[PDB]
């Protein structure tokens, strides 16, 4: 005794679309990270809930250590090194999905993390206290 | 006070909520069969607090406790005049007058958060 009245986007519907266009549905995933509840069985229920808590806190900590916490997408001051890819700025944004780019760069992750941490610490916070005094 | 503004009008208890806010900024501070229950209790507390902090953090309202946003209020949800609301109604009555349209309001805040604030910010960054 029901009808269907679809309005908004699907969960991971934009995954087959292009990156610069599929960047506008980022809300729905973080909307749907910590729900589903909305003897042995309750044991594995609590197991699953703990795992979800752990991954969400891990990624929020990685957000918080960077200077891109709380908000969504942002900027930085680390200039790009062309040793990783060498595209000419249209082939990525208009001609490439996300799984393709993920398989292209899945060896350089930790260096990028460390260098963002480096520029976030250095010349941003000691520099702040330099600016906090004449 | 701990839930001290109960039997008041919404417009009446509209100024001293900051003392409520500092007093509601606690709960973990100032610290077998039963231990299973204790574990489950801690799990419930953690899940509720993280639910609230997630729903704050998605919107632009995750700093201060009151804020403004860019959504025009549609007259399909309620139709009562402004002074009629702020001087003649409690919180619970307003709750039962709005507790069917809540998810749509959430989704509209979400789309207003994503659109025209970050990709627009990204175009504003390019000089």
């Amino acid at each position, epitope marked *: *005794a*029901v*009808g*269907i*009245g*679809a*309005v*908004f*986007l*699907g*969960f991971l*519907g934009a995954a087959g679309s292009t990156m610069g266009a599929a960047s506008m549905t980022l809300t*729905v995933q973080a*909307r*749907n990270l910590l*729900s589903g509840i909305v003897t042995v069985w309750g044991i594995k229920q609590l197991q699953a809930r703990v795992l979800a808590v752990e991954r969400y806190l891990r990624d929020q900590q990685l957000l918080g250590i960077w200077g891109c916490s709380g908000k969504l997408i942002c900027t930085t001051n680390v200039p790009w090194n062309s040793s990783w890819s060498n595209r000419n700025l249209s082939e990525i944004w208009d001609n490439m999905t996300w799984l393709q780019w993920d398989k292209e760069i899945s060896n350089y992750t930790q260096i990028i993390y460390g260098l963002l941490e480096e520029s976030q610490n250095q010349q941003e916070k000691n520099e702040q206290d330099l600016l906090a005094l004449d | 006070g701990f839930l001290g503004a109960a039997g008041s009008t919404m417009g009446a208890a509209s100024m001293t909520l900051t003392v409520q806010a500092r007093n509601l900024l606690s709960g973990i501070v100032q610290q077998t069969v039963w231990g299973i229950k204790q574990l489950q209790a801690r799990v419930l507390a953690v899940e509720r607090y993280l639910r609230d902090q997630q729903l704050l953090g998605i919107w632009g309202c995750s700093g201060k406790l009151i804020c403004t946003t860019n959504v025009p209020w549609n007259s399909s949800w309620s139709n009562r005049n402004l002074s009629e609301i702020w001087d003649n109604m409690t919180w619970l009555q307003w709750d039962k007058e709005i507790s*069917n*349209y809540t*998810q*749509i309001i*959430y*989704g509209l805040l979400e789309e207003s958060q994503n659109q025209q604030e970050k990709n627009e910010q990204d175009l504003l960054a390019l000089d």
Partner: antibody
Amino acid sequence: VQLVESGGGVVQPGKSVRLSCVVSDFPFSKYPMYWVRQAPGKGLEWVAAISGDAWHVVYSNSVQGRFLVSRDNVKNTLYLEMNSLKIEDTAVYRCARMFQESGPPRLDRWSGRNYYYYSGMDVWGQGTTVTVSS
Amino acid sequence: IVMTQTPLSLSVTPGQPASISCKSSESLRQSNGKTSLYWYRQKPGQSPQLLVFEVSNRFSGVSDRFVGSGSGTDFTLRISRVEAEDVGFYYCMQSKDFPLTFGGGTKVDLKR
């Protein structure tokens, strides 16, 4: 409560009409309405049903490609149309009301999809009959 | 989704209990937490009138002889104190899924 079923008549095949149904004594913007069908000397049959806010509509297995129904919330008046008729479509046509008051739609946070809810009826009016003849 | 009446029809006499079934073809346990089986009766040359909703819940302004019964396997009815006013056709009706379906027909009269 007041609820009439106007619109008797007799036609040959291949026509187009307009039907009316006057209501009173309820807040018309809240309720759903149905259309049932009773063949002569027979039992009952469901045809069509319009949504509460007049945006969703379902038909029977027969006339998907024939009919059209619409709601006037201002005049509190139902409008039905039956086109491309057949002589064996002669029955009793009645305009009756769901018992249970429905409410607002529901929006899931999982790929939106606004859902509606229906249930059966309580009140039948008198009725009418158009015999499609030759 | 189909639905059958059980049995067809019966002539009855006063001073007797009554029970009229309506066999399902599925189980219609709603996510709201109940089952969508309604009864409503008509009289000849007249309009139908609502008998019982909520499986087992008498309609407002109805004498106490009318209640409901049954679960998602199959259903029955429950009428005591047979009276001549209780004649006509009794229909069971599905209100779970589109399209709806109806009970066939129960002819009810006295005995000669």
